[PDB]
Design an enzyme around this catalytic site. Sequence first.
Site, PDB file in Angstrom:
ATOM      1  N   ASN B  10       0.788  -1.091   0.261  1.00 24.15           N
ATOM      2  CA  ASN B  10       0.261  -0.085   0.202  1.00 24.15           C
ATOM      3  C   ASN B  10       1.067   1.241  -0.037  1.00 24.15           C
ATOM      4  O   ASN B  10       1.585   1.428   0.750  1.00 24.15           O
ATOM      5  CB  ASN B  10      -1.193   0.187   1.046  1.00 24.15           C
ATOM      6  N   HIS B  12       0.141   4.688   0.188  1.00 20.62           N
ATOM      7  CA  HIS B  12      -0.015   5.188   0.948  1.00 20.62           C
ATOM      8  C   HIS B  12       0.345   5.593   2.931  1.00 20.62           C
ATOM      9  O   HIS B  12       1.408   6.121   3.254  1.00 20.62           O
ATOM     10  CB  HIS B  12      -1.207   5.593   0.949  1.00 20.62           C
ATOM     11  N   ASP B  66      -1.495  -3.375  10.528  1.00 20.92           N
ATOM     12  CA  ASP B  66      -3.090  -4.045  10.173  1.00 20.92           C
ATOM     13  C   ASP B  66      -3.763  -2.025  11.104  1.00 20.92           C
ATOM     14  O   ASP B  66      -3.464  -2.222  11.795  1.00 20.92           O
ATOM     15  CB  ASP B  66      -3.998  -4.935  10.247  1.00 20.92           C
ATOM     16  N   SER B  67      -4.735  -2.159   9.931  1.00 24.01           N
ATOM     17  CA  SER B  67      -4.944  -0.529  10.216  1.00 24.01           C
ATOM     18  C   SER B  67      -6.732  -0.186  10.354  1.00 24.01           C
ATOM     19  O   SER B  67      -7.644  -1.000   8.788  1.00 24.01           O
ATOM     20  CB  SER B  67      -4.659   0.802  10.308  1.00 24.01           C
ATOM     21  N   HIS B 173      -3.238   7.864  14.679  1.00 23.17           N
ATOM     22  CA  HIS B 173      -3.528   5.507  14.877  1.00 23.17           C
ATOM     23  C   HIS B 173      -1.879   5.378  14.047  1.00 23.17           C
ATOM     24  O   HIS B 173      -0.830   4.595  15.360  1.00 23.17           O
ATOM     25  CB  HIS B 173      -4.079   5.350  14.447  1.00 23.17           C
TER      26      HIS B 173
END
EC number: 3.6.1.66
Lengths: 189, 189, 189, 189
Positions: B10, B12, B66-67, B173
């Site tokens: 990913n 971003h 993981d979010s 986060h």
Amino acid sequence: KLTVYLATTNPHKVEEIKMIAPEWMEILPSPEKIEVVEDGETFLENSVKKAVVYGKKLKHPVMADDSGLVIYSLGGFPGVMSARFMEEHSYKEKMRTILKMLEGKDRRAAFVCSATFFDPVENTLISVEDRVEGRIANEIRGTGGFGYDPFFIPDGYDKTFGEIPHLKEKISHRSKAFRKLFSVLEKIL
Amino acid sequence: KLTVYLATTNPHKVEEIKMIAPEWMEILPSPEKIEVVEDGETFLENSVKKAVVYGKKLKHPVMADDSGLVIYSLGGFPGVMSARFMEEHSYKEKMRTILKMLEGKDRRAAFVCSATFFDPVENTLISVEDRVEGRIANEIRGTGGFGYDPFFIPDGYDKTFGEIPHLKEKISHRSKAFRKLFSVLEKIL
Amino acid sequence: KLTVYLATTNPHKVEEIKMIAPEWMEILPSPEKIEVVEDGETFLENSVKKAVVYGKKLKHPVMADDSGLVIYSLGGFPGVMSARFMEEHSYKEKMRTILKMLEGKDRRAAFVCSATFFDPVENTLISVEDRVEGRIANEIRGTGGFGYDPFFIPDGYDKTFGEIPHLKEKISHRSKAFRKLFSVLEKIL
Amino acid sequence: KLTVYLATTNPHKVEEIKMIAPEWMEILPSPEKIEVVEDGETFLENSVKKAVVYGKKLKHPVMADDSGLVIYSLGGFPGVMSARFMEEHSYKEKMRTILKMLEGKDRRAAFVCSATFFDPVENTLISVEDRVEGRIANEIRGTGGFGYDPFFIPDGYDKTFGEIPHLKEKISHRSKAFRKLFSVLEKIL
């Protein structure tokens, strides 16, 4: 100051961990036997799985242990199958069988422990591994310790852990892995 | 001093982590896209799984993320389904749909990140979680950031992360979870 | 001739399955509620997992059902999350929320059922899937059936399964999937 | 009438299965080698897992085989570890080692095969198991077949499968399991 559950009902493992716990940790056995499918390929994977399953159930900090005997000449056997191998037989029978496997082979081996802490409130997980290198004895000696102890000779010694079980407190895989875990916890908590 | 792979392709996420890495860490993207079944019930479980799968493949230290977005009034939805929800649609379409869900409901929400380091040589695993609490805006605002950013207003602000994406570096986060991870790594490595 | 346990205590599933069972089969709800982590990405994987876990424990033939509502314009949501979605809320509230999500969208949907038989003594496993195509209504109507039944209208009708629950025996995903399963069984037992 | 991929590149399994396939079925080895973590505790679970993963990827009907040698006096070893046991060694060395383990023990054993069909378009899964009972020989004899064949003597015979490989088509676990599977398929296709 910290109460922590152990994620094992194995009495030998509870004894061994309780006797090396730091003064600031109260270690209790889990007040429920929780089913865990231990289907990890490695000790780390099984230690993490058990820690997570118990932690999610108890909603309280837990530690787990997955550990095993690794014989280099046998491709690392029994490894994660240390308990499951011939599980309905006595360890004496398991050792006699493994002694036959090793005739004519290099006897170098290790016990390996992955020690895992999980706090399910904060979602902090810490897992660390350590080991005690040694060799397989040519016969079973002593009745001290548990499991494969009576045919494992640690590096630096000529007696088995069945013969000198008191040394596990200083040099075993479990004592070393859990002390390594405790050291981390002292830094970060 | 430490080169570490990220277990995500990913773009971003790679950008966001690279920009907060400590001077002693060289963060590289994984040079292979590795398939991971992300079937964990929680962010922690998915972060650990990805870290372990990539680490075993690359045989080199890795970190995973993981979010997700957690909306309290919707039972924590979308949560671990943050990406999988309406995955063939644009985030604009996802946000418009979720805005309809929230009509007449409490708008409190959080983004949550579980950041995991795994060294597969030592078998050390460290996972830590953090979050940015906020609320869902009443309309989509801005095109900054990514994903649900344009309708998430962090605690302390009246603008969305789509409107003030520069603040993610300080308060998201991800920034908080990874800084929490880096802090641990500075202590123990 | 054959007594089979069902791997659910959902009384509606029990009733629905018992009402189409063939004269040669006695169906019993499982007398032990067995914990299964239902982490499959598909209905088939969850149905198989339940059948296998329950059968291994009961040491007797079992059948399992994993079913859900699939709304195409919402990327197949709620799907395998049909129960878990806002699980602390009533289905009435879940339907109200879904109705808001669907404003302005294509309203096509299906209920899907994967029905699995497992005989743990022989190690025979049979899983078959079926579905009923339909559309989501503009409002909740009726209190018949269970779950999302009161806002699902099957093709060929103008009333919801909440309004015409008696028709489920004839046309539902669960009736078709199980009849397909029993047909197979009749041939091979 | 039906082309089916096999979820293995093991050439012996391919040959063995092709040689008993019915005239209406074309069997093709999978043109893509798909990674599956085979962490099932049983042959059925590993067979199902392989069938499902391969079928999901290939989007075409597949069959899978998970098989092994079960030696009763060794607690069922090697079982699901039949390949993984000393995996870097030749089967000749694995047999020599097992022969040493068995000195003085009951020598009964079985080969077990779980055969699974999966049609990912319909979501139909069928798994059936069979076995051939026998004993372990006192020495390795013959080079026919594969794996542990050269020290396994099927009941009714005095020669190993290494010596009489031509008889596998008629009596082996794999022939019986697949014939059982094809019988089911013939009824329901």
